[PDB]
Amino acid sequence: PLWIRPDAPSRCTWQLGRPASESPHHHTAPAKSPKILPDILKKIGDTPMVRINKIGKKFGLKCELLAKCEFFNAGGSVKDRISLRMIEDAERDGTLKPGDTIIEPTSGNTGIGLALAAAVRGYRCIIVMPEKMSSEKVDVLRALGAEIVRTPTNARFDSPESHVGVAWRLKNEIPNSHILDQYRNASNPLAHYDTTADEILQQCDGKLDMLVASVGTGGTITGIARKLKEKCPGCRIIGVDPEGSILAEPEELNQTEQTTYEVEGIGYDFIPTVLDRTVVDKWFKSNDEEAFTFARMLIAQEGLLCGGSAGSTVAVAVKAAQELQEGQRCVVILPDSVRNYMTKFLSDRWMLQKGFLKEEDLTEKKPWWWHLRVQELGLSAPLTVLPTITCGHTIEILREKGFDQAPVVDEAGVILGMVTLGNMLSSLLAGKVQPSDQVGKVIYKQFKQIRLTDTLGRLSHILEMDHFALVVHERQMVFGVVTAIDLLNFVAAQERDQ
Amino acid sequence: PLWIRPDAPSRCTWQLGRPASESPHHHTAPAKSPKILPDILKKIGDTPMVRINKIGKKFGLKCELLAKCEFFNAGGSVKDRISLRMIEDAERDGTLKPGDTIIEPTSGNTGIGLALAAAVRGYRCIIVMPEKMSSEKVDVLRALGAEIVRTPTNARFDSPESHVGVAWRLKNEIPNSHILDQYRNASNPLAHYDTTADEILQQCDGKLDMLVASVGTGGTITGIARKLKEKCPGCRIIGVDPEGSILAEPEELNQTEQTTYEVEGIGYDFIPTVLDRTVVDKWFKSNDEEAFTFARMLIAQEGLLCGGSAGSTVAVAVKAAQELQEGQRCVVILPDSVRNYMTKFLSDRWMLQKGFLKEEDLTEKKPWWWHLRVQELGLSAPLTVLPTITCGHTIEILREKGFDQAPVVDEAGVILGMVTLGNMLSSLLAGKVQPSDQVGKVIYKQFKQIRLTDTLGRLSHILEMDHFALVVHERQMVFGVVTAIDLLNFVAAQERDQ
Ligand code: HEM
Ligand code: HEM
Ligand SMILES: *Cc1c(COP(=O)(O)O)cnc(C)c1O
Ligand SMILES: *Cc1c(COP(=O)(O)O)cnc(C)c1O
Numbered sequence: 001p002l003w004i005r006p007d008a009p010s011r012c013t014w015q016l017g018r019p020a021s022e023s024p025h026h027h028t029a030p031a032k033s034p035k036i037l038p039d040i041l042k043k044i045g046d047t048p049m050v051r052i053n054k055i056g057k058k059f060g061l062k063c064e065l066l067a068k069c070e071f072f073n074a075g076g077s078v079k080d081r082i083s084l085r086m087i088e089d090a091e092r093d094g095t096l097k098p099g100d101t102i103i104e105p106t107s108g109n110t111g112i113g114l115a116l117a118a119a120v121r122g123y124r125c126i127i128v129m130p131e132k133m134s135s136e137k138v139d140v141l142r143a144l145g146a147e148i149v150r151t152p153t154n155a156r157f158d159s160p161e162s163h164v165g166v167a168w169r170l171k172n173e174i175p176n177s178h179i180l181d182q183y184r185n186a187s188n189p190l191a192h193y194d195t196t197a198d199e200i201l202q203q204c205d206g207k208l209d210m211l212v213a214s215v216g217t218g219g220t221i222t223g224i225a226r227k228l229k230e231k232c233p234g235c236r237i238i239g240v241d242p243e244g245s246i247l248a249e250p251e252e253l254n255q256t257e258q259t260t261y262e263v264e265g266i267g268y269d270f271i272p273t274v275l276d277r278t279v280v281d282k283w284f285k286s287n288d289e290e291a292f293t294f295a296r297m298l299i300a301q302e303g304l305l306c307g308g309s310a311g312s313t314v315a316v317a318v319k320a321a322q323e324l325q326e327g328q329r330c331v332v333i334l335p336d337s338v339r340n341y342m343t344k345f346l347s348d349r350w351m352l353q354k355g356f357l358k359e360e361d362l363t364e365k366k367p368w369w370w371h372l373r374v375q376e377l378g379l380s381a382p383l384t385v386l387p388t389i390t391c392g393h394t395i396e397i398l399r400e401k402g403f404d405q406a407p408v409v410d411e412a413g414v415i416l417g418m419v420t421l422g423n424m425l426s427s428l429l430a431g432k433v434q435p436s437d438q439v440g441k442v443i444y445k446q447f448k449q450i451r452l453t454d455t456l457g458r459l460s461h462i463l464e465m466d467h468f469a470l471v472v473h474e475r476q477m478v479f480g481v482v483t484a485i486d487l488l489n490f491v492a493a494q495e496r497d498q
Numbered sequence: 499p500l501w502i503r504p505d506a507p508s509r510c511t512w513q514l515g516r517p518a519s520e521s522p523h524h525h526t527a528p529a530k531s532p533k534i535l536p537d538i539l540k541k542i543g544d545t546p547m548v549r550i551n552k553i554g555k556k557f558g559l560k561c562e563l564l565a566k567c568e569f570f571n572a573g574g575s576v577k578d579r580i581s582l583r584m585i586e587d588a589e590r591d592g593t594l595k596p597g598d599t600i601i602e603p604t605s606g607n608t609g610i611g612l613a614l615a616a617a618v619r620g621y622r623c624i625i626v627m628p629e630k631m632s633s634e635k636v637d638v639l640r641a642l643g644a645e646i647v648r649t650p651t652n653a654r655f656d657s658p659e660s661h662v663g664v665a666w667r668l669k670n671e672i673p674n675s676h677i678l679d680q681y682r683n684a685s686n687p688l689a690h691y692d693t694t695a696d697e698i699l700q701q702c703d704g705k706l707d708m709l710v711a712s713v714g715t716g717g718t719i720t721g722i723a724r725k726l727k728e729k730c731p732g733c734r735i736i737g738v739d740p741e742g743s744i745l746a747e748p749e750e751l752n753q754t755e756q757t758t759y760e761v762e763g764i765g766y767d768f769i770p771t772v773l774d775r776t777v778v779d780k781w782f783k784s785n786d787e788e789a790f791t792f793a794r795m796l797i798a799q800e801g802l803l804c805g806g807s808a809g810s811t812v813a814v815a816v817k818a819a820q821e822l823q824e825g826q827r828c829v830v831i832l833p834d835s836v837r838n839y840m841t842k843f844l845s846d847r848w849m850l851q852k853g854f855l856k857e858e859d860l861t862e863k864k865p866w867w868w869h870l871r872v873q874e875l876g877l878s879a880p881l882t883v884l885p886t887i888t889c890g891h892t893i894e895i896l897r898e899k900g901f902d903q904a905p906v907v908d909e910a911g912v913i914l915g916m917v918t919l920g921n922m923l924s925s926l927l928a929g930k931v932q933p934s935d936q937v938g939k940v941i942y943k944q945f946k947q948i949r950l951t952d953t954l955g956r957l958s959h960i961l962e963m964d965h966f967a968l969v970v971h972e973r974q975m976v977f978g979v980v981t982a983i984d985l986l987n988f989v990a991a992q993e994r995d996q
Contacts, residue, residue, distance in 0.1 A: 035702075036701055036702070037549065039548065040801045042546075043570070049533065050535040050537065050538050051534060051536055066534065116801045119797075119798055131963075135963070139840055139841075139845055140836065143794065143798065143803075143836070143844050144798060149982040150963060150965050150982075152916075152921075152944065153942075156921055158920075158924035158927075158928075161921060166965075170986070173986055204534070259930075300617055300641065300642060301617065302618070303618045338641070339836075339837045343841075346638070418650075420657065422659065430656075444659070446650065463647065464640065464648065465633070465636070465648060466629060466648055467648050488668070488672075
């Protein structure tokens with residue numbers, strides 16, 4: 001029966017204070033990045049340590065708050081590291097032959113790093129990930145050439161349908177295939193122990209008072225915390241676990257209602273082999289709301305384009321470093337980029353749909369003019385023209401009636417678009433078009449519709465995807481054409497009273 | 499009348515051979531990146547020079563093909579550079595006060611860099627971009643806190659509705675607002691002349707035989723080509739223009755049918771001030787197909803996650819460096835990341851929808867088993883259960899009938915999902931659930947449907963978004979449940995004949 005248990009307790013005999021000389025493992029030092037990178041894989045590591053200027057103090061931190069930004073790696077996640085190490089170690093092992101197939105269960109970042117490295121190094125790749133993870137990860141993977149298999153999100157790691165189970169079943173059916181097994185592989189936390197912690201230590205010049213990291217496989221926090229407990233004994237290690245996962249200690253903290261959560265990449269229903277919970281000094285629970293709030297905040301305030309787990313981490317950090325005082329510094333790990341989450345926590349519609357943003361929370365911060373009917377804009381019914389009308393003729397019409405723009409509406413009363421006087425003239429002067437040509441040749445095709453009873457805020461959101469907003473009867477009937485500028489002119493006029 | 503013409507010829511008096519001492523402009527040297535970055539903006543520049551190993555030789559290049567990967571910048575595009583420079587110069591100018599509003603017309607990358615820098619440095623930001631650009635750019639921008647206005651893509655730069663026009667109209671209506679004007683600003687090509695070209699020169703140790711870049715505002719190719727013609731006179735400069743734009747020389751090359759194209763960020767209906775076409779040694783036309791092909795190829799082969807303009811560039815480069823021979827090297831500029839294009843050229847559905855991929859081109863590379871009806875899988879009609887059934891009871895049923903899994907179908911014949919024997923047992927042993935509990939507590943909710951007449955390839959694509967594929971009558975009737983593994987077992991059996 002070959003399925004190796006991912007939650008198997010660690011056989012590692014490391015304990016704080018064992019001389020490094022005693023370690024069986026193969027260790028690699030970070031190497032200086034060259035002038036010319038010979039391949040893309042060398043762009044992994046040497047990530048920037050960027051300071052958190054605003055978010056720290058907004059919450060009243062007396063300390064220095066640092067972020068190790070790992071989304072600057074080639075694959076765009078902290079997983080690219082282990083992804084390299086694993087494969088490289090698997091080549092020195094002689095276990096991984098050229099042309100072999102690599103199969104991995106993953107949150108999907110590890111999958112990205114691996115499929116990438118495969119694309120470069122000529123390995124076939126098969127990634128198994130939960131149904132929960134974002135479609136962006138899928139798009140990137142399929143672009144890298146990796147075959148993709150999905151597993152239910154409700155599956156237990158014990159059950160055959162889980163990503164671990166499906167990975168193994170695939171290994172057993174496929175020749176020359178290996179499972180690099182990020183949960184049990186020593187290469188994973190060794191990646192962080194050898195490089196990431198060396199980096200964090202060098203960048204901080206040895207002075208470090210706290211570290212905070214979200215816990216996945218547990219490789220990051222483990223690998224870091226071991227080298228930290230060795231080289232920086234004073235440093236406290238703080239873990240972040242989502243509600244619904246079991247990772248945190250003590251167990252009391254795990255008692256909760258939801259078994260599912262929206263944050264991708266962190267937390268599990270089992271304790272992975274590579275996770276050493278003994279090196280973690282304190283655990284904190286984060287939830288989905290805290291996560292996305294603080295992620296959005298990282299973006300808007302610090303200008304770090306990063307994913308949700310990062311939000312969980314920082315949300316925890318501002319609570320955890322409160323005990324710190326001036327002169328101390330706290331490093332926080334930011335795992336991956338916004339690239340994965342584009343249609344999820346980055347999109348307001350999804351945030352509403354999943355109920356993290358209440359419409360109230362939005363509306364309170366919004367201006368006076370936000371809740372107002374569009375009718376109050378002073379719209380004027382525009383002249384309409386047929387698509388089959390002739391250009392110069394339309395100019396004659398627009399000038400003769402004194403109109404600057406017209407919606408082009410079909411014979412059937414279907415609005416096809418817009419033509420503007422300006423674009424017409426400019427197009428003519430240039431000889432791009434003739435006075436005898438169809439007006440369709442110059443029509444701006446794209447627009448959006450609204451009721452006279454819609455809120456101006458609605459208009460705002462629309463005006464972010466379109467230039468023209470046609471207020472329409474519930475028709476061939478256009479009560480008005482509203483652009484962004486017109487809304488401006490409205491508000492600015494309402495200003496010159498006070 | 500304040501609208502400054504973007505296509506205004508350059509007032510720059512530089513000509514090759516003027517001593518740099520004579521230059522009026524303020525020049526900045528690239529600075530060594532610190533241990534701790536004090537803010538994120540310091541992550542701009544020092545981009546990697548990564549070699550192209552496969553794509554070069556596949557097309558028979560005898561030369562060394564290098565890529566300057568600019569998507570590693572903080573905002574994820576080459577625009578972050580000018581975005582910094584512009585703002586920084588605007589602060590030394592004393593023109594930009596704290597709290598001022600910055601308004602920019604843009605392809606959207608410049609907008610991202612600018613809005614980012616605004617988020618960091620406390621400037622209000624308003625970005626005007628065409629309706630054509632991708633919604634991802636919008637999502638990122640809105641996340642950074644920038645207000646967004648869109649303009650028709652058919653608008654001429656002369657007409658008031660163009661992004662340039664709308665930008666200016668906004669400057670004129672808004673107090674404390676400035677237009678940094680990437681088309682006319684010297685800060686833009688000076689950014690590349692001062693840093694990017696210094697970088698390219700250092701990384702290549704002075705030996706460079708060719709440079710290829712796509713042309714936007716023209717800042718990149720200009721700024722680079724000037725310092726190149728000064729410091730590396732032998733180097734040929736090659737520009738890339740999309741079909742439908744006017745940028746290329748001589749004019750004969752521009753004669754074309756389409757006025758529109760899908761590639762974002764490059765090409766224009768006018769020649770920007772900052773573009774110096776005299777330093778460009780030869781021009782090449784690229785189109786949409788070449789672009790997306792080669793972009794996808796960059797990803798799949800070289801593992802560079804990058805956008806379309808990059809594809810145009812490389813597609814040109816493999817044609818242009820053919821004249822080169824062994825021992826020479828050619829640098830190619832890769833502007834931005836895949837982040838922007840996720841739902842466009844990265845998604846196969848969009849590639850089909852826009853007709854760049856013909857279904858034939860796909861099907862030819864696909865295996866023997868690709869065109870086969872799903873019926874040929876040997877499906878077995880599964881036992882169905884009600885959502886209201888009890889857990890232990892379902893176990894009794896599944897074991898008693900020898901079935902391992904059942905679709906959970908509603909009383910109304912609506913399929914709600916799946917329960918598997920394994921997940922049931924594992925859940926019970928763990929005490930997560932009781933024998934008396936509703937089966938709904940453990941249902942895998944997500945699946946997809948197919949006809950018995952569907953192609954196995956269809957099944958493949960589906961099996962990338964879902965674990966379960968339920969083949970269904972056109973109903974309460976499930977002819978079978980197909981997972982990825984089952985398709986594997988099918989094919990692998992069809993293998994053991996030969
Ligand atoms: C003096 C230091 C260390 C010693 C003596 C040591 C020793 C060992 C040994 C002997 C094993 C294999 C047990 C077996 O399979 O029979 C092992 C496994 C492992 N080691 Fe270490 N180790 C050290 C440090 C580390 C560090 C710093 C890390 C990473 C943070 C690490 C990661 C692992 C992992 C993930 C395993 C796999 C556990 C398993 O296969 O069940 N080791 N270690
Ligand atoms: C010895 C070298 C150079 C000299 C003497 C020089 C001179 C000038 C002068 C005098 C102007 C302003 C004309 C006016 O507004 O009255 C100008 C504008 C400008 N310069 Fe240079 N320049 C040099 C190099 C460069 C380089 C290397 C770049 C960037 C690649 C550059 C970029 C620009 C740009 C974009 C303008 C704006 C043109 C306009 O406002 O219409 N200059 N230059
Ligand atoms: C894997 C991952 C983590 C967790 O890192 P571990 O080393 O597994 O603890 C956090 N966030 C994201 C996005 C991840 O992919
Ligand atoms: C701006 C841009 C370019 C062109 O660079 P220029 O310096 O304007 O010539 C190419 N690709 C993308 C994605 C861009 O945003």
